[PDB]
């Protein structure tokens, strides 16, 4: 997370950390708890070459990454079937936990948005995670969970900005319908935040608008953070996640 602050312990109870087995249970991506038994993340986090179920663990909300870990087993990994190398997109995945989490005030699910929610500019939105604090600058020990309020940029305005200073023709789309844009030169998600939630407060309730996906660097001019638009994937999510 670029800009922003350390999250108070009481905020973002749906934030998760995805771990891969090695010399230590290394954080590779963020995720969000969307159902007591299901984690939402980015496809690039777990695909295209999916690791064994034995090689992965889910860590629920923790204030300090690697301090007081309590790792949870996974029973299933589902990468969106349209995710593939040669196209940035369909960047969404699900992990089914072996057991539903016993939800508390400090650890619970995020509400998924209704299909009609477009999350227009002006909306109060926040992105959280344990990623880099700048380009090639690590979040330092004790690895506190960070948060940052990011402005939403309309898709067509965002796509035009990504065409500035590139070889890519105005003919072909860079920012697609299954994507959402947020962030500026002071506030953005960064490497290590991928898979994590972008949440907006709508009519008193926090809705997950996006999944940290990609960008060109972090907090760079004419390069806002790109997220997978959750509404676009609701029907796919609901083929696995009980409503």
């Amino acid at each position: 997370i670029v800009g922003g602050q350390e999250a108070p312990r009481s905020k973002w109870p749906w934030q998760v950390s995805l771990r891969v087995h090695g010399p230590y249970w290394m954080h590779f991506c963020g995720g969000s708890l969307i159902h007591p038994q299901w984690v939402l993340t980015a496809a690039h986090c777990v695909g295209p070459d999916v690791k064994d179920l034995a090689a992965l663990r889910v860590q629920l909300r923790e204030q300090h990454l690697y301090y007081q870990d309590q790792l949870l087993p996974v029973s299933r990994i589902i990468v969106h079937p349209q995710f593939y190398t040669a196209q940035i997109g369909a960047d969404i995945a699900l992990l089914e936990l072996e057991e539903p989490v016993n939800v508390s005030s400090h650890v619970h699910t995020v509400t998924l948005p209704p299909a009609s929610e477009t999350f227009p500019p002006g909306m109060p939105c926040w992105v959280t995670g344990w990623g880099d604090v700048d380009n090639d600058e690590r979040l330092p020990p004790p690895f506190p969970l960070k948060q940052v309020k990011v402005p939403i940029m309309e898709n067509h305005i965002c796509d035009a900005k990504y065409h500035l200073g590139a070889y890519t023709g105005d003919d072909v789309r860079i920012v697609r319908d299954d994507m959402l844009c947020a962030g500026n030169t002071r506030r953005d998600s960064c490497q290590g935040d991928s898979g994590g939630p972008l949440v907006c407060k709508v009519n008193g309730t926090w809705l997950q608008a996006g999944v940290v996906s990609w960008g060109e660097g972090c907090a760079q001019p004419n390069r806002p953070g790109i997220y997978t638009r959750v509404t676009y994937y609701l029907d796919w999510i609901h083929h696995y996640v009980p409503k």
Epitope: H21, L53, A54, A55, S75, R76, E99, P100
Partner: antibody
Framework: EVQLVESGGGLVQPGGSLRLSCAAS????????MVWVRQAPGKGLEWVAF????????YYADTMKGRFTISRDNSKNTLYLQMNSLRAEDTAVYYC????????????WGQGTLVTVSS | DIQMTQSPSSLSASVGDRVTITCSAS?????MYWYQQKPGKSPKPWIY???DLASGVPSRFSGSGSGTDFTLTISSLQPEDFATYYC?????????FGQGTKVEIKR
């Protein structure tokens, strides 16, 4: 001593039903994933089923799905295998085995219980 | 889903011989697990996470491989190694075992 003891095997007619049970001792049973593995006489190990610590997750081999049901009773430290519509090809020793908590290999196995499906 | 093909189905080797058992997964997997089972006995964990030896397993045993190809090696075959060895993946459900390799000792 960490132990698993299977029971309930025996001779059953084709189309019959049988419930196998596996008594666990020496560990906190409710913390572990548990599985059934069978071995036909003179043949290899064949995975049957898996059940998570809290019973929310169950999986089966393709040829036994539907007909076999895995369950557990954590207050009784017991794992069960409900076998219905039994066929000659189900004849095997059925092993109860514990999934290692940290590394997921099957680290404790019972002595096994022989099931013979014949008329 | 993941299918295991183990080879050879049986072998006869001399004490002190280097013995290699192979296991092929139908699709790429992170780890390989191995079990030893003696006649009329129940299986025992032998190797896990491709190369980690279970407790009490002697260091003449080793495991290696990646992707779809894995092996179990005995650097110096011993009389007590007489057994059937099985490979097993833990990639996703359904789980499967390889067909086994029966090891006999020459004399």
């Amino acid at each position: 001593e960490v132990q698993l003891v299977e029971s309930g095997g025996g001779l059953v007619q084709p189309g019959g039903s049988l419930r196998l049970s596996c008594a666990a001792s020496g560990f906190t049973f409710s913390d572990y994933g548990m599985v059934w593995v069978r071995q036909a006489p003179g043949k290899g190990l064949e995975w049957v089923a898996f059940i998570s610590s809290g019973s929310s997750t169950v999986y089966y081999a393709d040829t036994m799905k539907g007909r076999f049901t895995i369950s557990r009773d954590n207050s009784k430290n017991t794992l069960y295998l409900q076998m219905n519509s039994l066929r000659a090809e189900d004849t095997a020793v059925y092993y109860c085995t514990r999934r290692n908590y940290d590394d997921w290999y099957f680290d404790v196995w019972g002595q096994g219980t022989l099931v013979t499906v014949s008329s | 889903d993941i299918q295991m093909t183990q080879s050879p189905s049986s072998l006869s080797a001399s004490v002190g011989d280097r013995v290699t058992i192979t296991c092929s997964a139908s699709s790429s997997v992170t780890y390989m697990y191995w079990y030893q089972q003696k006649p009329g006995k129940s299986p025992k964990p032998w190797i896990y996470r491709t190369s980690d030896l279970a407790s009490g397993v002697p260091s003449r045993f080793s495991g290696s491989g990646s992707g779809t190809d894995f092996t179990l090696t005995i650097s110096s075959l011993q009389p007590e190694d007489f057994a059937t060895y099985y490979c097993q993946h833990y990639h996703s459900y359904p789980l499967t075992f390889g067909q086994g390799t029966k090891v006999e000792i020459k004399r």
